[PDB]
Amino acid sequence: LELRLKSPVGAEPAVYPWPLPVYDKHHDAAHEIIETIRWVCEEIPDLKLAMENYVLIDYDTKSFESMQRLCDKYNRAIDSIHQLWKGTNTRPSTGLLRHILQQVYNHSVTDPEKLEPFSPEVYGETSFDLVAQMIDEIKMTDDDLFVDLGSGVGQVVLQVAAATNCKHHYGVEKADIPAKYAETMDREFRKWMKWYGKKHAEYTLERGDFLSEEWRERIANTSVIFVNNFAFGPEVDHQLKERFANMKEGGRIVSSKPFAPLNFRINSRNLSDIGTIMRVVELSPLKSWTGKPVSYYLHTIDRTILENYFSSLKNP
Ligand SMILES: CNc1ccnc(Nc2ccc3cc(C)n(-c4cc(-c5c(C)ccn(C)c5=O)cnc4Cl)c3c2)n1
Ligand SMILES: [K+]
């Protein structure tokens, strides 16, 4: 009939129907169950001690009785640990977070006929580790407001919210299918994070056009913008540079293609270019990274670039 996994923190149990749902070509719900148990065991050393060793070695993913036995062994072990704590919320580790995001996606994007080499289906394979590097480089604080422009199903927002302490994390998506899927991703993320007893910052996944009037002031008041501008046309890029021109000093933009040349040299013929008000650096996880040789671009609002040019004109 069904398989149930009791929460290590006493939240509502995770309930899976039998036959288990089929996921994409290289994922199945039976492995998700086993890896969930394994992650909770890393999380609680007492749980690994109490749980019967063999259970996580000798199993049949295609057998209801075998999967039920595995779940029952884990559930009984959770009960023993909960009894031990009678007699007497942190951020997830990077590894647990990759598992949680995968789990959230699988429960949200059922039959992925809807929605490329960098698709939501493969987020965990290169984008996750790269976003983890961007998070470590940026070092956001409680004073920061974070926005992912074109958030898709919301994977980057969820990862940043689980990793940082920004006052708020926003994801804005214009397309109908991804935005609709983001609503389930949001529900599933909140539910699973509660199940593991893991903390995350506040976040909102919204449907909208980041080039709208409403979003002009919102971009101007964001301290950290993430934007996958890789496929942006010249008009989106031009409009986006105009939005960025209203940002505060020290405002940061992390993107897949630079918005200004890395070697921008202010002169009399380029005073209208975004390069006059922003520093740009190419960051690469390769410079102990073993993934794809991929770069990201960090832009920092700095109007002193423009101020020095005028100062140099007046005081040669
Ligand atoms: C990627 N998924 C999502 C989903 C929702 N939001 C974001 N936001 C976001 C914001 C800032 C950056 C900067 C980079 C480097 N990436 C980045 C780029 C690419 C990529 C490459 C290198 C080449 C071609 N294409 C088409 C690509 O997508 C792959 N993965 C990442 Cl993590 C970003 C992603 N990304
Ligand atoms: K044991």
UniProtKB/Swiss-Prot annotation:
Stated consequence of mutating residue 90 to M: Found in a patient with developmental delay and intellectual disability; likely pathogenic
Binding site for S-adenosyl-L-methionine: 123-126, 146-155, 173, 209-210
Family designation: Belongs to the class I-like SAM-binding methyltransferase superfamily. DOT1 family.
Other observations noted: In contrast to other lysine histone methyltransferases, it does not contain a SET domain, suggesting the existence of another mechanism for methylation of lysine residues of histones.
Function: Histone methyltransferase. Methylates 'Lys-79' of histone H3. Nucleosomes are preferred as substrate compared to free histones. Binds to DNA.
Subunit structure, as described in the record: Interacts with MLLT10.
The protein, known as: Histone-lysine N-methyltransferase, H3 lysine-79 specific
Organism: Homo sapiens
